[PDB]
Amino acid sequence: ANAGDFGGYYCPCHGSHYDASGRIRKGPAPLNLEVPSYEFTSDDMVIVG
Amino acid sequence: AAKNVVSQFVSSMSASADVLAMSKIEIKLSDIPEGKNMAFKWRGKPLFV
Amino acid sequence: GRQFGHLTRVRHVITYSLSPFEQRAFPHYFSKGIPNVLRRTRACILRVAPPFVVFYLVYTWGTQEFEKSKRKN
Amino acid sequence: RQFGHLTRVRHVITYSLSPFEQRAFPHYFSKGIPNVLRRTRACILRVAPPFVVFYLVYTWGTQEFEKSKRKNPAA
Amino acid sequence: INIRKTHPLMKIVNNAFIDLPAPSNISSWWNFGSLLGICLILQILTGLFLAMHYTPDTTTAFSSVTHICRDVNYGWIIRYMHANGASMFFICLFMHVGRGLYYGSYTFLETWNIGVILLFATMATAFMGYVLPWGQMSFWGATVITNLLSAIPYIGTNLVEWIWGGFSVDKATLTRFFAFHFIFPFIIAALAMVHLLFLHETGSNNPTGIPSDTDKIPFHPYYTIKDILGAILLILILMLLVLFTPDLLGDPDNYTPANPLNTPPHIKPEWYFLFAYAILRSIPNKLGGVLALVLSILVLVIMPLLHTSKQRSMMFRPISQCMFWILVADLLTLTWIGGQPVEHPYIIIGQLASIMYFLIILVMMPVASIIENNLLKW
Amino acid sequence: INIRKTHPLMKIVNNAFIDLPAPSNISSWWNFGSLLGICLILQILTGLFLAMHYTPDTTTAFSSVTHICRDVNYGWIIRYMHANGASMFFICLFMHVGRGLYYGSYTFLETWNIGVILLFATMATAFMGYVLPWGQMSFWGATVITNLLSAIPYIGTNLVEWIWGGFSVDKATLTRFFAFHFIFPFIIAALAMVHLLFLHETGSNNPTGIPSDTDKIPFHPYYTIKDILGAILLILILMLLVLFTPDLLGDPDNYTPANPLNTPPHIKPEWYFLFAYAILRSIPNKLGGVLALVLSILVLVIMPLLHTSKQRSMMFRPISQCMFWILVADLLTLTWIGGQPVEHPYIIIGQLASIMYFLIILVMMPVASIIENNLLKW
Amino acid sequence: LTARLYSLLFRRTSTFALTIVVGALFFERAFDQGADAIYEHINEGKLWKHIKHKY
Amino acid sequence: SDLELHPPSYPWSHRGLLSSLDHTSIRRGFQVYKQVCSSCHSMDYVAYRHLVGVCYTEDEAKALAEEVEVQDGPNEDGEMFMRPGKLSDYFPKPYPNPEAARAANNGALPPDLSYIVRARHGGEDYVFSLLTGYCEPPRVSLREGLYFNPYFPGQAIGMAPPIYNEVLEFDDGTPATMSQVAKDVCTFLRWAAEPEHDHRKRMGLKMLLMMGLLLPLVYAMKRHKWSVLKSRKLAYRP
Amino acid sequence: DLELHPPSYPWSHRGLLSSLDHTSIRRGFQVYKQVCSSCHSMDYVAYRHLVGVCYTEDEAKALAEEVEVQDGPNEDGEMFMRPGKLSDYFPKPYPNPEAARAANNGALPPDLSYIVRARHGGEDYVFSLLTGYCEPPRVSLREGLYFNPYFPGQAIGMAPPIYNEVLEFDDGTPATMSQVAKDVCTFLRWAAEPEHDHRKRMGLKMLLMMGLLLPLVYAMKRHKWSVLKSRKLAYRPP
Numbered sequence A: 001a002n003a004g005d006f007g008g009y010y011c012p013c014h015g016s017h018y019d020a021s022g023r024i025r026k027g028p029a030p031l032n033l034e035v036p037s038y039e040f041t042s043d044d045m046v047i048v049g
Numbered sequence B: 001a002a003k004n005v006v007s008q009f010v011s012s013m014s015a016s017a018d019v020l021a022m023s024k025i026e027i028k029l030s031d032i033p034e035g036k037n038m039a040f041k042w043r044g045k046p047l048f049v
Numbered sequence C: 001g002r003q004f005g006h007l008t009r010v011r012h013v014i015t016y017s018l019s020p021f022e023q024r025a026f027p028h029y030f031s032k033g034i035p036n037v038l039r040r041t042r043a044c045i046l047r048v049a050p051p052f053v054v055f056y057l058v059y060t061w062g063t064q065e066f067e068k069s070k071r072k073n
Numbered sequence D: 001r002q003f004g005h006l007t008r009v010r011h012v013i014t015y016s017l018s019p020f021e022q023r024a025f026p027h028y029f030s031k032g033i034p035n036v037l038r039r040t041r042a043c044i045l046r047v048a049p050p051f052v053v054f055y056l057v058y059t060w061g062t063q064e065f066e067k068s069k070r071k072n073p074a075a
Numbered sequence E, F: 001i002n003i004r005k006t007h008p009l010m011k012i013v014n015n016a017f018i019d020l021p022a023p024s025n026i027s028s029w030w031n032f033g034s035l036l037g038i039c040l041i042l043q044i045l046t047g048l049f050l051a052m053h054y055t056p057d058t059t060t061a062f063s064s065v066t067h068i069c070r071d072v073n074y075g076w077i078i079r080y081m082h083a084n085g086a087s088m089f090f091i092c093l094f095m096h097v098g099r100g101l102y103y104g105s106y107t108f109l110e111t112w113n114i115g116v117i118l119l120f121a122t123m124a125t126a127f128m129g130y131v132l133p134w135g136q137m138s139f140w141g142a143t144v145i146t147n148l149l150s151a152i153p154y155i156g157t158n159l160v161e162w163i164w165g166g167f168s169v170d171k172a173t174l175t176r177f178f179a180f181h182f183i184f185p186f187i188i189a190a191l192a193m194v195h196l197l198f199l200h201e202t203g204s205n206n207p208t209g210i211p212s213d214t215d216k217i218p219f220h221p222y223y224t225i226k227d228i229l230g231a232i233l234l235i236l237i238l239m240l241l242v243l244f245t246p247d248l249l250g251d252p253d254n255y256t257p258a259n260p261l262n263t264p265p266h267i268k269p270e271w272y273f274l275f276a277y278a279i280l281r282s283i284p285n286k287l288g289g290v291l292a293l294v295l296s297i298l299v300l301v302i303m304p305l306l307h308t309s310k311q312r313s314m315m316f317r318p319i320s321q322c323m324f325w326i327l328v329a330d331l332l333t334l335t336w337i338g339g340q341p342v343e344h345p346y347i348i349i350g351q352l353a354s355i356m357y358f359l360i361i362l363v364m365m366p367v368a369s370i371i372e373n374n375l376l377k378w
Numbered sequence G: 001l002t003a004r005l006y007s008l009l010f011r012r013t014s015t016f017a018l019t020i021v022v023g024a025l026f027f028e029r030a031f032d033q034g035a036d037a038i039y040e041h042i043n044e045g046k047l048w049k050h051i052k053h054k055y
Numbered sequence H: 001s002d003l004e005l006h007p008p009s010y011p012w013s014h015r016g017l018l019s020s021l022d023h024t025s026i027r028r029g030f031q032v033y034k035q036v037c038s039s040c041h042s043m044d045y046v047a048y049r050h051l052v053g054v055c056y057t058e059d060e061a062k063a064l065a066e067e068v069e070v071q072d073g074p075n076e077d078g079e080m081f082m083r084p085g086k087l088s089d090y091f092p093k094p095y096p097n098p099e100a101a102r103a104a105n106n107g108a109l110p111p112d113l114s115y116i117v118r119a120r121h122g123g124e125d126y127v128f129s130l131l132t133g134y135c136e137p138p139r140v141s142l143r144e145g146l147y148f149n150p151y152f153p154g155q156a157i158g159m160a161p162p163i164y165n166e167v168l169e170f171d172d173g174t175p176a177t178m179s180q181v182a183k184d185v186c187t188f189l190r191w192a193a194e195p196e197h198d199h200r201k202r203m204g205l206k207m208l209l210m211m212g213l214l215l216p217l218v219y220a221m222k223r224h225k226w227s228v229l230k231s232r233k234l235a236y237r238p
Numbered sequence I: 001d002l003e004l005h006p007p008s009y010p011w012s013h014r015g016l017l018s019s020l021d022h023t024s025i026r027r028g029f030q031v032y033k034q035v036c037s038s039c040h041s042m043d044y045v046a047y048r049h050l051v052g053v054c055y056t057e058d059e060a061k062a063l064a065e066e067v068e069v070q071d072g073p074n075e076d077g078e079m080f081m082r083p084g085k086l087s088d089y090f091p092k093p094y095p096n097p098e099a100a101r102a103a104n105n106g107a108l109p110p111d112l113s114y115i116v117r118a119r120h121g122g123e124d125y126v127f128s129l130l131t132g133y134c135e136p137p138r139v140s141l142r143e144g145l146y147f148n149p150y151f152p153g154q155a156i157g158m159a160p161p162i163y164n165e166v167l168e169f170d171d172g173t174p175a176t177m178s179q180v181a182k183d184v185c186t187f188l189r190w191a192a193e194p195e196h197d198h199r200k201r202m203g204l205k206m207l208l209m210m211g212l213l214l215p216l217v218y219a220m221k222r223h224k225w226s227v228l229k230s231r232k233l234a235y236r237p238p
């Protein structure tokens, strides 16, 4: 968290440079992150699965 | 007989019945400060909020 | 104990051998197998069976002795 | 392999002596050390030059690693 | 030339399974080698998958095998295959031994010795595998046979405290027995290769006892498809046992968690140890009873050294054949008396059956052999 | 005449060990095969003791290893012996491979192929055994290499969800790895017997590369006492590492409970993978990286099919021998660069080191064999 | 029938293996339907499909 | 008094080799256990995920799993509060400790009901006769801390016969006699002893058909290959 | 962030044959029992590991019997605390690890069994970490993290305990900072390796055996190879 070039995500296993939403622009990382089946409720909660 | 043997032994190495039980969690949001990540257990893997 | 070529020295023998496709799958099964198994059964009745009837008689004797001991008390 | 049907060797005389009667270490300090000095003369031209290149790459990569780790920019 | 006669592994294959001059006189009582081998590799596979889901600890073994039979897919049938395949392996092992005693093939001396050592190893592997499920029966039988090993004066106490890892059957004993049952069938397979080596030194045996070197048919493809026939017969019997009546062999008390206080009253080993156990409890001597068992296996060593006949087999000696069938009935008698509770007429007939066992195999065999000998103008 | 020449065990032992026709001009490089055998039986013995004191359960694995190291008498020396003996096993392994490529014994093709299969089996054995202590580094290295297995397009997903033992690494993963880490070394032993059987089919090789049928001395007792010399030196090294520097090769992050959420930035495995992980993290291609690894060991397979020189030694081909030393330095460079973290000059020189690896092997050594073939009016 | 069958599917080994694999899949399908029909047929009533068909 | 009474084999619906289990009776018996017998007997190796496609439905499995709350883990403080649980739930222990049940009785721990059919000499018919055969002691009572039951080794139990004319009078028609609840609990204990019964019978049918297929074929091929040596004849030439 | 490599110190056990002071082990255990056994645990060392190493019989029994146990069942079966004779571990001041994270300002304090062996450096790292509390040169300091450059990230949620509460050793050593820090780091080195004295004993054994035995087998190999090293060839043709 708060690492890499773009300030967002940064894997230390091979130095994949992600953005804040985890999108690769430097490294051999093939794909980007997957949105889970989550839905917010405005009581500052979220159902995740 | 041989392909049924292969099917039953692959099914024995396939999975376990209790592993297929996985949950739908409820997560609270704003206990995490502005600019911080935190993981929650889903399937053992980290769950980035 | 070894491979072929050196095992025995036999003259005076001619073996006839028939093709497998030449003859039937089951050459006279019922007309031969039943008297042959009757002969092999009669060849072992008084040698195989009298141990087992001794087994069953000692079985029933010891069993009824146990029952008689456990039904008077 | 077998032992008795391997080759055909003529013209050969071999002399050898009983291992008790000659000593255990005949001139180990008089022949073996010039022998290994001869080996050292006969090896370094083929063996040595990779390792010095590796040592230079080792030290160069370490120093470039630290000088890339420390920046001190201007602002 | 021929690829089979050039490649060094293929030379071993050719000498093993193709150019083996076999006796043409052998019926289904000689299929037992392939039967035991296929039982062994299926035991390897079933125990391997069990070990992929088994936990060797006293707390976790019962629950983990429960997790296997209820949760892991087909683990219930793989466990049933392992246990009932051990039972089928025992049936084939006893009948292999019975063939080797009946047809006079026990004149092969060092092959018989290798078989005796294999019998030791299969007994040890069987007992420790039976210890592994952490049952009440397994706990108490392990305690009893551990004290049987403590019967040895001045050596046995240190040896039993050496194999404990504690005071009794605790987690150290459980994991050590797991290691030995987990490693031993490879050594069994190696000594089986040695067994096969000495037999292919000698050559196989026919029912007559006369060597069939004038009538050698090959090992392939005749005996290969005949062993396939016997093997699939074993498959159907074994699989119908594991899928129709799983409970005709397994003890009911085997499905209980181990209580360190109970000692349930019908405590017994499994049926392939009860004849080993009926000799014990029908002799009022601890060291005497375990020495009687060890001497029974040593009698199985001795019997190649008392063949004072002039034939090879008992095929044409009917008196010794009838004594052999009385010994068969006496073996099943000792097994059933091992399967009974300790009762006074059962005590009497068990002692009489054990002393009858010793008197038939030890004494009556050279007596019957010498009556058969001197009867035939010899 | 002789018990050794008539008894069937001692026939094989005599024609393999005592009266084996071996060449006579051999330095310490041919001790390494016997040292691999001694390390094989020694590591099997230490693993046997460990399996008599280990539990494969993710809740209790780390505490069980601690129980071995502290509570069990000398379990610390046996754990250190198993670990450092695996390390010296890899040392003797790469020395044996380097010898077989350097003196040019790779012309024996099936021996080379059996050796490659042994190399695969030993690497998988050692990796699953390194997973088995159930530490932080074991957990995360198993995670990364499991996903490397999942890198296969269209085929890898079912296979790696099948070998997960779950949705991720859990108790089932630990038990499957324990089962394979047990079962592979005996397969390695049997294939080592097949390795030595093909070598005794061919016959051994001198340092000169000249065929040496005319200087046959027996293996007994000369090379037996030479192997005793090598064995005593190798036990010297092993006892030295277990008595003074345990913590030298032993990685630090294998000493904590495996936190499933920590992921320390230290990511490198034990040193016998770092040559290959550097090949992985150089090429910017997922399938290309795993393909480059598999192609590296397959180039090690197809090393003899690029041989075209007219003498099999490197002692008389000097510039090819210099290229061999450059290849040794390249391998050690790849290992140390795999023993580093990832930054920009490291990325540059790791990519360049992989390029120099395949450039030296796939091009320069056959062309050097061509030119020193060409120089002698051939 | 027999002469036709031997003259077609018993003189090349690979075509023989391919047609017995294809017939093995077809026989596997037919045996699935037959065995499932028989086992559901001799134990009608107390089977979960009808109790789920309630709901 | 060292004279056990062996249970006869009874005509069940799971009697024969082709026979099956009533999942509706399994449903009734689990309602019996959960509503009567779970308070005194542990069945800890049975979960609600074993009750998905056997007799029950999906959403009612969530209903049953929310009927029993056990525990959640640490809420960053280890508070260990009460959680419903959706599908991963197991069945709760009535007693946290064995001596909790020992002090709640005269010792005499109620065993876990996972394996009781396959765990005593005599299976489900032993269970049926155990729950059925209650009468009065003619002359022999021992200390009046236990009860009377002939179907027991030792002939005395500390368990009261929990049947007594409609303990539940449950959901469908099915009048709650001794016999109906005993048949339902025997069917349910048989299913608890084997989770894979009708699947085993289906594979047994498959296997009987396949071994009726192979045994003509393989014996025909063995007779066919051995047919050469069965046909050979000998002749003497000097 | 940067990462400072710690120095190497001339420890009196740094030499490859020098042991540990058991008196230093006793006083370092006194350090651990006074102040260090309140946030960290050392859950893999029992009191019987101290009775032949740093105390006598009754001393270690008193140290093991002044501690609670919360042992298991009684006649009712619930719980009861206990002194505990010798099988006691250290009584885990933070029971749940997430409750440990909620105890302080996050970053739960780890156990101290393998810390000398597994923190990228030996006891020098621990000593410099304990004494490295110093002045921040205009850094972040997010309200719960303390500045120490002997740490990756220089932000530690552990207060400096080392000058505060001089603990009054039973021998009576005047507690400075570095003396008590050296003693507790030596105790942690022992807690890493209890085998240290015995492994240096067997190192002495093996070094004498390989200093006297290695030329023997080498000389024996040269003795048996003395034939082929001395053979001489000659060429007779006809």
Ligand code: HEC
Pocket: H033, H036, H037, H039, H040, H041, H105, H108, H109, H110, H111, H116, H120, H127, H156, H157, H158, H159, H160, H162, H185
């Ligand atoms: C509390 C009172 C109950 C209730 C409601 C039920 N059981 Fe029974 N049970 C209880 C005790 C205290 C004991 C111990 C005495 C003993 O084991 O002899 C038992 C015993 C059993 C047994 C064991 C018999 C044997 O293994 O031979 C079984 C199988 C058993 N109980 C079953 C059972 C069933 C199916 C119940 C629901 C109808 C049931 N018990 C109710 C205490 C109690």
Ligand code: HEC
Pocket: I035, I036, I037, I038, I039, I040, I104, I106, I107, I108, I109, I110, I115, I126, I129, I151, I155, I156, I157, I158, I159, I161, I184
């Ligand atoms: C409660 C307050 C204590 C006490 C009495 C001691 N420690 Fe320390 N410690 C503590 C926390 C909350 C942390 C973690 C903070 C962080 O993650 O930055 C630590 C950490 C350590 C470390 C590791 C270094 C680190 O992780 O930053 C060591 C080593 C260490 N603590 C040692 C130690 C010793 C020897 C103590 C006895 C004097 C001791 N701690 C007391 C909280 C607390």
Ligand code: HEM
Pocket: E030, E031, E032, E033, E034, E036, E037, E093, E096, E097, E100, E105, E106, E108, E111, E112, E113, E114, E115, E116, E118, E119, E122, E192, E195, E196, E199, E203, E204, E205, E206
């Ligand atoms: C450990 C299990 C055993 C295995 C796997 C095994 C394996 C074999 C095999 C493969 C054969 C050759 C084929 C055959 O006739 O069966 C064989 C033959 C034989 N075995 Fe065993 N055997 C075992 C146990 C024993 C034992 C305990 C003995 C008795 C000491 C024994 C004695 C013999 C004899 C005498 C033969 C030759 C019989 C003949 O020539 O017909 N075997 N065994």
Ligand code: HEM
Pocket: E040, E043, E044, E046, E047, E048, E050, E051, E054, E065, E079, E082, E083, E085, E086, E087, E089, E125, E126, E129, E130, E131, E132, E133, E181, E182, E183, E184, E185, E186
């Ligand atoms: C090396 C291969 C083998 C392994 C890994 C192995 C492993 C195991 C394991 C883990 C168990 C306990 C689980 C269970 O009981 O179902 C077990 C039990 C058992 N094994 Fe093995 N086994 C092997 C070979 C054998 C062999 C060759 C036999 C003898 C034929 C055998 C006989 C048994 C028996 C009788 C039990 C007890 C079965 C039971 O009570 O459920 N095993 N084995």
Ligand code: HEM
Pocket: F029, F030, F031, F032, F033, F034, F036, F037, F096, F097, F100, F103, F105, F106, F108, F111, F112, F113, F114, F115, F116, F118, F119, F122, F192, F195, F196, F199, F203, F204, F205, F206
């Ligand atoms: C798995 C571990 C291995 C073992 C236990 C093993 C065992 C042996 C043994 C005992 C020898 C004879 C003595 C000696 O020359 O040192 C030998 C020789 C040899 N091995 Fe291996 N080996 C192994 C791995 C390999 C590998 C990976 C290769 C390469 C493919 C290989 C290729 C050779 C060759 C070419 C020789 C003959 C060397 C010569 O004649 O100079 N071995 N091995």
Ligand code: HEM
Pocket: F040, F043, F044, F046, F047, F048, F050, F051, F054, F079, F082, F083, F085, F086, F087, F089, F125, F126, F129, F130, F131, F132, F133, F181, F182, F183, F185, F186, F254
């Ligand atoms: C079948 C025999 C073997 C058994 C039963 C066995 C058993 C074990 C066990 C239980 C462990 C975990 C405990 C520990 O880490 O010290 C282990 C670890 C290990 N084994 Fe083995 N092993 C065997 C063979 C081998 C072989 C042949 C090698 C390779 C030379 C090997 C290399 C390793 C390595 C590298 C570790 C990790 C050491 C560590 O991280 O502490 N094992 N083995």
